[PDB]
Amino acid sequence: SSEKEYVEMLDRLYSKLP
Amino acid sequence: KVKMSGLITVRTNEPLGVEKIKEVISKALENIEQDYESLLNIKIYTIGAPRYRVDVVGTNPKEASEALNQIISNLIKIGKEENVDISVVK
Amino acid sequence: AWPKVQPEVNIGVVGHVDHGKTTLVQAITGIWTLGYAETNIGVCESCKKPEAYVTEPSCKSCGSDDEPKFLRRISFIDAPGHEVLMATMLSGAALMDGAILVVAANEPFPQPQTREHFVALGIIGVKNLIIVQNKVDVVSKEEALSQYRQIKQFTKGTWAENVPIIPVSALHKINIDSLIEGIEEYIKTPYRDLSQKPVMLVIRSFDVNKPGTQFNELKGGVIGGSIIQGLFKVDQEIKVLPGLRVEKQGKVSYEPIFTKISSIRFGDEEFKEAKPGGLVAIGTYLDPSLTKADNLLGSIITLADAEVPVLWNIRIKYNLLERVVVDPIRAKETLMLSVGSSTTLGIVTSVKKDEIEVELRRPVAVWSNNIRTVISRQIAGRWRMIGWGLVEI
Ligand SMILES: Nc1nc2c(ncn2[C@@H]2O[C@H](COP(=O)(O)OP(=O)(O)O)[C@@H](O)[C@H]2O)c(=O)[nH]1
Ligand SMILES: [Mg+2]
């Protein structure tokens, strides 16, 4: 629930986008 | 063969509901063959509740329509007994 | 190897229209969407998170061959209409133990509907919330992170202040596993007091008999609804309230319809009992004539012996919303009142203060004090929600 927490999930997302 | 059919309305608020409806109908059909020896078969089914159709099939036009009427008469009378509202649709 | 169990929790899916709620649900359950989907939830004890969480008996999705551990079965609430969803939670027709607020990273936050949805969850006290930033695939990380800060900024100072935010791509099914992990963390199943009297709101009623069915094969009417509390079982004697409208000359009244439960089913699975959670299909002994074409919609069901007030007139401690999904309520006015799954018109007798009286055209069953009701008024020919309240017995 922290920004850093949110950001890591955000990086994980783009890293799988085609 | 001859086919006489009737159209009716059937409903009940009885707790046993649908099971009460079946009880009334079978009681109305009991021994109908012994009264009209020319009958081959009878079918009572729903065509969209509360509406049902009663089709009487036999080899004698007169006996068939008499049986149809006796079945309908039995249904209304016995239904009033078991709180099952049954009437003929015009 | 997973067991077949009824859903044990209800999760509402809200957010402005077109933001991805249905796709999201489909990405989670694999089901397309009152929309309603169910799904089992498991976890690969060997693997690492979020990937360890799955929706089916397989750990291959994260590099493992162990049987995943079954956690629970959940169901989701998703409607196509914006106002239906608003009416749903504001009236309490559908039980919600938690919610997922969907936000499209695409457009600006918060949109109009997304706004009303947040005030609603606050109104009905649904604490367990997860804000899902969707469609991140069509925005730059700079943009994604920006809105994040806007959202956190919006939740600041509110009950949703510490609510988690998960970015996913419903469309490409990315980070759906992180969302599942989120659900298990933030939307835990509530404790259920199974000793409360059984109460089920009727949302659907059918006659499943195909035309031409021989009388001996006739099946009892089917009721579809959501169990609010208690435990229903096959063979229990129950009653439908208010029941059957009866006219005896000048007097019109409503009579409870007594019946029995012949079967209990969730999806294509049958059970001997049902607790709160998910949407249930109940078979009964009722004359199909009474259930056909959702004729019992708006009724409630409880044990034949439950003592339930059925009243024509009610008192409602109310509150008006800031917008129409807002002039004060005045006497002699006819409003639409939604209690549970029922909707009834009624005229206002008195209007003193934060309280009103209503003469209902049709009576309603109040299985408990202070049940929620939505208040709507006819604007330009169509009824619109303008407030909410609690019925006081
Ligand atoms: N780019 C993108 N489009 C999405 C995503 N999820 C849904 N959509 C699209 O956005 C539109 C609205 O989605 P829909 O699921 O019907 O959401 P609803 O209107 O909120 O219930 C559809 O055209 C989808 O194809 C997502 O994660 N990314
Ligand atoms: Mg949709």
Side-chain angles (χ1 to χ4, degrees), chain C residues 53 64 75 83 96 102 210 217 222 235 261 268 293 308 369-370 372 374:
Chain C
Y53 291 94
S64 178
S75 62
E83 48 186 2
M96 268 179 76
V102 170
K210 304 134 160 278
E217 293 169 52
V222 180
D235 286 326
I261 289 175
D268 61 63
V308 176
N369 181 49
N370 274 197
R372 220 120 83 302
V374 187

Side-chain angles (χ1 to χ4, degrees), chain C residues 45-155 157-310:
Chain C
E45 295 165 297
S46 127
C47 309
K48 65 310 298 174
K49 329 306 167 302
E51 322 88 31
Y53 291 94
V54 294
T55 63
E56 43 184 291
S58 175
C59 298
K60 55 78 191 304
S61 55
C62 58
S64 178
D65 239 289
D66 194 347
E67 286 170 29
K69 197 189 77 161
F70 178 66
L71 297 179
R72 49 167 185 172
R73 187 178 178 72
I74 69 185
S75 62
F76 295 82
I77 305 299
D78 177 44
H82 151 57
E83 48 186 2
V84 297
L85 286 179
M86 203 67 66
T88 300
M89 58 185 132
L90 227 45
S91 71
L95 192 71
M96 268 179 76
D97 310 294
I100 286 170
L101 190 182
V102 170
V103 178
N106 192 305
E107 310 161 13
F109 176 83
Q111 293 288 43
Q113 275 151 41
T114 298
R115 214 154 200 148
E116 314 176 79
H117 288 183
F118 183 79
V119 321
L121 297 176
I123 287 174
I124 64 179
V126 177
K127 321 175 181 184
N128 309 316
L129 175 66
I130 299 183
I131 295 178
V132 173
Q133 183 177 62
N134 192 50
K135 323 212 289 189
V136 180
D137 48 0
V138 295
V139 305
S140 66
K141 172 177 173 183
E142 172 279 290
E143 300 167 6
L145 178 56
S146 292
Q147 181 175 64
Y148 168 74
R149 279 182 171 67
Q150 300 190 76
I151 297 177
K152 260 294 183 177
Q153 219 296 301
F154 181 106
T155 59
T158 87
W159 55 269
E161 183 173 302
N162 301 305
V163 163
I165 306 175
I166 302 173
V168 305
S169 173
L171 186 60
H172 302 60
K173 293 181 174 65
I174 305 177
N175 266 187
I176 306 305
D177 54 349
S178 283
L179 181 39
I180 288 178
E181 167 167 276
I183 298 176
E184 287 300 301
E185 184 54 44
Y186 300 106
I187 313 187
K188 299 199 178 308
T189 300
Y191 164 85
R192 253 54 135 135
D193 176 357
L194 302 180
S195 71
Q196 303 182 61
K197 73 182 173 200
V199 174
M200 173 187 46
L201 307 193
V202 179
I203 56 176
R204 296 302 304 281
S205 76
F206 324 67
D207 171 358
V208 313
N209 294 287
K210 304 134 160 278
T213 305
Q214 298 301 129
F215 82 92
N216 265 310
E217 293 169 52
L218 205 73
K219 297 193 169 189
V222 180
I223 301 300
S226 45
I227 295 175
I228 300 307
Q229 69 182 50
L231 177 64
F232 285 95
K233 301 190 175 185
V234 167
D235 286 326
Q236 274 176 334
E237 286 182 51
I238 54 172
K239 53 172 150 73
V240 179
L241 298 173
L244 173 82
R245 176 162 165 287
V246 177
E247 302 177 6
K248 300 322 180 198
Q249 285 173 352
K251 263 287 161 64
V252 68
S253 55
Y254 287 74
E255 276 181 47
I257 312 179
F258 292 90
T259 191
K260 189 187 209 64
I261 289 175
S262 71
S263 80
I264 292 181
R265 175 162 46 64
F266 285 93
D268 61 63
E269 219 44 50
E270 292 196 52
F271 305 80
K272 305 162 179 178
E273 66 171 43
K275 317 164 192 173
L279 255 50
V280 74
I282 304 289
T284 66
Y285 281 63
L286 292 161
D287 172 0
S289 287
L290 300 169
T291 61
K292 80 202 245 209
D294 298 312
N295 178 65
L296 290 183
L297 178 283
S299 303
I300 71 166
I301 286 166
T302 191
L303 305 182
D305 202 286
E307 266 150 46
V308 176
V310 169

Side-chain angles (χ1 to χ4, degrees), chain A residues 4 6 11:
Chain A
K4 300 153 182 176
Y6 161 80
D11 290 320

